[PDB]
From Swiss-Prot, chains A, B:
The lineage of its organism: Eukaryota, Metazoa, Chordata, Craniata, Vertebrata. Residues 257-482 are annotated as: Accessory region. GO terms for cellular component: collagen-containing extracellular matrix; endoplasmic reticulum; endoplasmic reticulum lumen; endoplasmic reticulum membrane; extracellular exosome; extracellular space; Golgi apparatus; rough endoplasmic reticulum. This is Multifunctional procollagen lysine hydroxylase and glycosyltransferase LH3. Lysyl hydroxylase activity is strongly inhibited by imidazole.
Length: 700, 700
């Protein structure tokens, strides 16, 4: 058994990149011994991701190997560091090396690179990989020194070609006992073998398994165009995320805070923007340490920004508004906001937030800053759907693709901080990263590529990890796809696209607690129940939308009411189908009135059918009252839309057979009474002002 | 001015017939002086209504006139008595006689009788009547004596021919100044002039007016085949019935009573015969003075007669039953019953009563006996219709005809005792009339004529008046036309044909008082009303009719009930349409449940639509309960059909949302509760016996 104290891992790294630190973490997990060559030096090996080169690695290794030229007792493994993670122990590594019977074992790959013609000089192998890969090899220090000492070439010459031609010398190959890891027992190069590699999980550790050769490799090399696939594996292997310990690089549990440049982007008509702007004032971060930048591209949102701008300017240390009259494109606005933080050394963190991002966690900014990453984004999903603000994978031409663990992350079956290829809508970028690693102005612009994609690609080109955290509940994403702005209050029509946000804005705040019991629902008259339904904003906007239409009924008008025999009992009103809001109001009936009715009348079941839905207006000089009658309905919904005294005097509902009077209606509250046989009722005269009510004859 | 003390009326009468007494009454009304010739003698003038004759009148007048042969101061009017009424005063009579300028004025008529060939010897007249009528003439005693003294012929020779040939002597006509009353100024012969005579009314007196000649005749002669028309006029003229004094020959205001032979006739299947038989025990007349005869021709009624025969035999002095096994025809049975009283000198009055006669006035027998007529009938009409138990007129061939005052009598605009040509169903005949005036056995039989018509014709042939009294409310006539006896209880199906009687038998006795307020209706649970509806007999017969059908439902059966979502809530029941009683029960709903519902739920209006009508049976070994559910109805009718404790234990209705239980239902009482939304209810288990209820889902 070879002593693990005799094993030395040698790698090359000119800077402590995130890839290098990910490698060191995997090495320290198995208690490896790693000597790093080249830290602080300039990389003279040319463009590594674009062409051949990397000879500077061999030059540095050759100089380092002169100390160990006679050390037969020492085993040395050389690996890359930026795109390599370790998945096995040094004990298992050395046992597999001895089993190989080799004295210097190179990794094998599918492609004969960089000279494809040399592939016939290679020995013929069976199902295994056939050609040498310089990204990783392990052997005796003496044998390695005899190979690397022959290096006499330029810093940008290809290292793999140098090792390949030495391996293709049959005399040298057999004298020094050089070999290749054909079946990936030790080294797993990913390029050309993505469909052979799967994750193998354990309790507190993850590995990869080669399903082609049924092996458990020690070294995972994301060589060539497999960087993102290695990022994916690196989220688990070796102790990234485990079924028992969760993520092992996050903060599972949570004096001046860093100064932050908060940039808000409104690049399309967005629902509930006033609610988004008011939510900025509620973010749990000292506003004296936050600078606000807001780019609005929509003239539709100019009144919204203007309403809240005094409070924003009074809240944050400094504010800046870039409006639609500046003709900025989204890529230009995002370049400008980011460069405003880059050119300010007092900007310690950059926080980009889009209008369709609803942050339910007011501690989002603290949590992401405390995660201490270069770039990190909170996970935000469309409510009840799989769509969210990140991608797990890329198609070969850098387009959307679904990763194998995307659904587990969105559903939060696995939580942590994840290295992902794409993020959007909300992210926190370290300001020093913008200054030292991405100093260019054209991060979002420069191409015909989409700005969101150009931003992520600009960071991936620099080796910057794009982190995504589902460690906490952060928020959701608003549906903005087909937002109809051709209304006086477009957010009234958002009951389908954004139901959660529509409820919080238009459904009464105490509605849910009333539905869950708690003695909020009243019964002022026998079998006439009284519960809060609509918020004051819903009533104010609904009435406003009615008067904006203006076509109130009068004579020649018929309602589904029943007086003495044949008799016409009309109201001055506007029906929901007149204004195009019936489909929306019927959804409110199905979602909110239906379940309330079944709770109050045990035994009754309803789908909330309603042909007659309309808003009644009462006025002393128009029609101030409604004479006794029945309703063509099983039960009737009567919602007060304004305040008694403030907006009108008099009014009220009176149930004759009980001598019971709803003297003082409540704005947004609803009456629930049977419509036939027993509740002959009457609308008491409106003596002053104007009285609005919303009426629905349910289940006719 | 001729002194009325010089006027003498001479008439002939062998007996004081009703016609003679009607004449004397009219004479005494105007204070006439009447000498009657021939009382007590045998009529030897032959058949007067069948051929020529009447010379016995002239023989008696001739002998009487010898006293007055020289009395120039005396005016004498001769008239018939059996078919003559007086309509004017002697003063008006004598003024018109002087105006004629005649010394002996005969009545004129349209027909030259009895020798039609003599009519050319008559003088030519204009529009007036041309020929002599011997029924009435007025003249000086001297002139009359010179005419009648020439009588030298047989008792059965024609008097009119004797007077006619004397009048056709032109020398005698002009010497004695004989004349005819061409334009009916004094005498009005009815034969050949019915369309010229109308009644002229006054405050306390009625006359007749001749519309052809615009005259007011003094003497009305119903000569020949106009007896019934004179009977009609005699009901008014001169003081029969007047607009101010009413009838002047009736009892407008009401110690052993006379013995009576009560004959009951059941000649067809008759509805409510048990109720008729029980009503006999309630007639307000001492039953020790009544003999009961009952002829039943229907085997369908044998059980009914048998049920009540012990009580009848115990009630009346003597009883006799003639059943269907005797093969008697209605004419033979009515002959037998009438002759049983005729051959008994202890029978003082005969009271014939048919099964379709409902006597609502228990004092009917006293009232009719106190009227002191030979034959008298109480007016009984079909409820709300014009059909009744008498005719006002006859067609020329002795068939039905409507008299000019028929509707006034049936509607009781004119009330009194009326001389009518036909009566039926109920009449009281003086026993001595049967013994002295109609001794024949074949009163109803003998012809192919209908028995009811043969009976009336037998009395009209003898000059017996058939009196009808609408002076009081006496009763009604049952509809027996299409009585369907193919049921276990046929009277259940009588809601249409006899609604008044159907109500009194099957609608609860305290129902009406409950509908009119009076605090009988209860409200045991909120909006669940409780009122009496069906009598105990209705419940017992309805349940019996259900079990006689026997086809109770079970599995595979569906009702219009609503449980949790889609759910089947059936009952072991029989629907009304299965047994052919839906049209009848729907009538009960329209007539009795409808108005009660509108009274209890002010504002609601209903036509009592009900598709689901059925009788539910609950049993411990079958289906003892009904689980919570709603009803496919606006309101539900729940009628208990038997007694709790006596017929079943347990059971009852429970309304869940009110924690209210109808623990003790009442037989024949009905529950009225809404069927939807608020009154989720349940049928409590029937632990012992059998529980029946009638259910209707109204206004679905
Ligand atoms: O700026 C740098 C770039 C690279 N390196 C070292 O050199 C190693 C090679 O870089 P990469 O992993 O990105 O390159 P790949 O493994 O994808 O394949 C590439 O390797 C080197 C290139 O010259 C080859 O042409 C190509 O095969 C790195 O893992 C790192 O250890 C630095 O130390 N500083
Ligand atoms: O039985 C009788 C019948 C008749 N009379 C007297 O004789 C009168 C004539 O009898 P009716 O009124 O019934 O006969 P009418 O007036 O209809 O015509 C008839 O009169 C007598 C007949 O002989 C004639 O042939 C016919 O014209 C009676 O009014 C009555 O006063 C009797 O006193 N006893
Ligand atoms: C929702 O419920 C709360 C409490 O149940 C309501 O609150 C109160 O408001 C009144 C005056 O508006 C105060 O006098 C009370 O002290 C408040 N109580 C509490 C506990 O805060 C609240 O008004 C309800 N919402 C609406 C829209 O009516
Ligand atoms: C109709 O109403 C009368 C009285 O309102 C009911 O009569 C009483 O019957 C009870 C026992 O049945 C007696 O104790 C009372 O004394 C009776 N009262 C009177 C005033 O007679 C009668 O029962 C009702 N009819 C039905 C069918 O229930
Ligand atoms: C690494 O070595 C330390 C001793 O310095 C030991 O506590 C730890 O358990 C080792 N880890 C593994 C995975 O063997
Ligand atoms: C008839 O005479 C009596 C007197 O005896 C008189 O009282 C009565 O009024 C008279 N009737 C008429 C109608 O003249
Ligand atoms: O004004 C009211 O409160 C009653 C009006 C009513 O019942 C209706 O909407 O038909
Ligand atoms: O048994 C009862 O009283 C209730 C039965 C019922 O409600 C029904 O007829 O459907
Ligand atoms: Fe309307
Ligand atoms: Fe209403
Ligand atoms: Fe049924
Ligand atoms: Fe029911
Ligand atoms: Mn590499
Ligand atoms: Mn006569």
């Amino acid at each position: 058994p070879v002593n693990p104290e005799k094993l030395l891992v040698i790698t090359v790294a000119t800077a402590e990149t995130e890839g290098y630190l990910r490698f060191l973490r995997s090495a320290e997990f198995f208690n490896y011994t790693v000597r790093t060559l080249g830290l602080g030096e300039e990389w003279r090996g040319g463009d590594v991701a674009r062409t051949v080169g990397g000879g500077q690695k061999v030059r540095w290794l050759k100089k380092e190997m002169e100390k160990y030229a006679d050390r037969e007792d020492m085993i040395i493994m050389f690996v890359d560091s930026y795109d390599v993670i370790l998945a096995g122990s040094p004990t298992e590594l050395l046992k597999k090396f001895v089993q190989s019977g080799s004295r210097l074992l190179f990794s094998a790959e599918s492609f004969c690179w960089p000279e494809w013609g040399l592939a016939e000089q290679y020995p013929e192998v069976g199902t295994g990989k056939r050609f040498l890969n310089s990204g990783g090899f392990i052997g005796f220090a003496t044998t390695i020194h005899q190979i690397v000492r022959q290096w006499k070439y330029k810093d940008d010459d290809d290292d793999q070609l140098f090792y390949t031609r030495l391996y293709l010398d049959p005399g040298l190959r057999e004298k020094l006992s050089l070999n290749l890891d054909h079946k990936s027992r030790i080294f797993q190069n990913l390029n050309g073998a993505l469909d052979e590699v799967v994750l193998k999980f354990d309790r507190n550790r993850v590995r990869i398994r080669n399903v082609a050769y049924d092996t458990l490799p020690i070294v995972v090399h994301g060589n060539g165009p497999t960087k993102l696939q290695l990022n994916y594996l690196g989220n688990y292997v070796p102790n990234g995320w485990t079924p028992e310990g969760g993520c092992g690089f996050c903060n599972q549990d949570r004096q001046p805070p860093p100064r932050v440049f908060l940039a808000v982007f409104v690049e399309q008509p967005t629902p509930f923007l006033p609610r988004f702007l008011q939510r900025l004032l509620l973010l749990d971060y000292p506003p004296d340490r936050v600078t606000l930048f807001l780019h609005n591209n929509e003239v539709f949102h100019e009144p919204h920004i203007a309403d809240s701008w005094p409070q924003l300017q009074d809240h944050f240390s400094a504010v800046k508004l870039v409006g639609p009259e500046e003709a900025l494109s989204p890529g230009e606005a995002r370049d400008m906001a980011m460069d405003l933080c880059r050119q300010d050394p007092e900007c310690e963190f950059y926080f980009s937030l889009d209008a369709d991002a609803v942050l339910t966690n007011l501690q989002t900014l603290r949590i992401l800053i405390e995660e201490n990453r270069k770039v990190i984004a909170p996970m935000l999903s469309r409510h009840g759907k799989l769509w969210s603000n990140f991608w797990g994978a890329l198609s070969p031409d850098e387009y959307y693709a679904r990763s194998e663990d995307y659904v587990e992350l969105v559903q939060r079956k696995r939580v942590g901080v994840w290295n992902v290829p794409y993020i959007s809508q909300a992210y926190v970028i370290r300001g020093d990263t913008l200054r030292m690693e991405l100093p260019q102005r054209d991060v979002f612009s420069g191409s015909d590529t989409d700005p969101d994609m150009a931003f992520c690609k600009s960071f991936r080109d620099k080796g910057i990890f794009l982190h995504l955290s589902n460690q906490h509940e952060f928020g959701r994403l608003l549906a903005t796809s087909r937002y109809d702005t051709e209304h006086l209050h477009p957010d009234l029509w958002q009951i389908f696209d954004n139901p959660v946000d529509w409820k919080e804005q238009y459904i009464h705040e105490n509605y849910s607690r009333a539905l869950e019991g708690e003695g909020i629902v009243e019964q002022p008259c026998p079998d006439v129940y009284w519960f809060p339904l609509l918020s004051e904003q819903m009533c104010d906007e609904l009435v406003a939308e009615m008067e904006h239409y203006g076509q109130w009924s009068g004579g020649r008008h018929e309602d589904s009411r029943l007086a003495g025999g044949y008799e016409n009992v009309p109201t001055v009103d506007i029906h929901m189908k007149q204004v195009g809001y019936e489909d929306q109001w019927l959804q409110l009936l199905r979602t909110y009135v239906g379940p309330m009715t079944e709770s109050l009348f045990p035994g009754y079941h309803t789908k909330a059918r309603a042909v007659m839905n309309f808003v009644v207006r009462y006025r002393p000089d128009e029609q101030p009252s409604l004479r006794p009658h029945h309703d063509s309905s099983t039960f009737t919904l009567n919602v007060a839309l304004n305040h008694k005294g403030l907006d009108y005097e008099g009014g009220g509902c009176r149930f004759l057979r009980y001598d019971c009077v709803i003297s003082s209606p409540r704005k947004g509250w609803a009456l629930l009474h049977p419509g036939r046989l027993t509740h002959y009722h009457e609308g008491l005269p409106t003596t002053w002002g104007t009285r609005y009510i919303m009426v629905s004859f349910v289940d006719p």
